Amino acid sequence: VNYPPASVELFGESNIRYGSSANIQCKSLPSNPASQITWIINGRSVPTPTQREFVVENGIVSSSNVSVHSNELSVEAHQINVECMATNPEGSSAKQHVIKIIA
Ligand SMILES: *[C@@H]1O[C@H](CO)[C@@H](O)[C@H](O)[C@H]1NC(C)=O
Numbered sequence: 835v836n837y838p839p840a841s842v843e844l845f846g847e848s849n850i851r852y853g854s855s856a857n858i859q860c861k862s863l864p865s866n867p868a869s870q871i872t873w874i875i876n877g878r879s880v881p882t883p884t885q886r887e888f889v890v891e892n893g894i895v896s897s898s899n900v901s902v903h904s905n906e907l908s909v910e911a912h913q914i915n916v917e918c919m920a921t922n923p924e925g926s927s928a929k930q931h932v933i934k935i936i937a
């Protein structure tokens with residue numbers, strides 16, 4: 835009856851020009867109860883401004899869209915490591931997405 839999200843779906847630009855932002859979307863796989871989306875940029879948590887929840891047959895999908903801005907403090911070794919985590923009381927799952935900053 836209750837179970838954690840089995841994984842997350844992570845979509846977005848994989849290469850962007852320095853100074854621009856990448857549109858990143860995270861969608862949890864279905865969970866019960868609903869999961870909270872947390873974002874991690876280069877190893878540190880950042881706010882989740884909004885998340886949107888949908889019901890499916892199994893449980894609930896949580897979705898969050900963010901824009902990741904590339905600048906001198908967010909870029910490390912010419913990339914940005916983005917991780918999305920989906921957590922409910924039964925456990926959590928996560929995926930990472932690497933944004934390359936092109937020269
Ligand atoms: C989130 O982004 C996806 C494309 O990556 C888009 O289809 C969807 O409508 C967006 N949702 C919101 C609330 O912006």
Ligand SMILES: [Cl-]
Nearest residue numbers: 846847848849
């Ligand atoms: Cl791309």
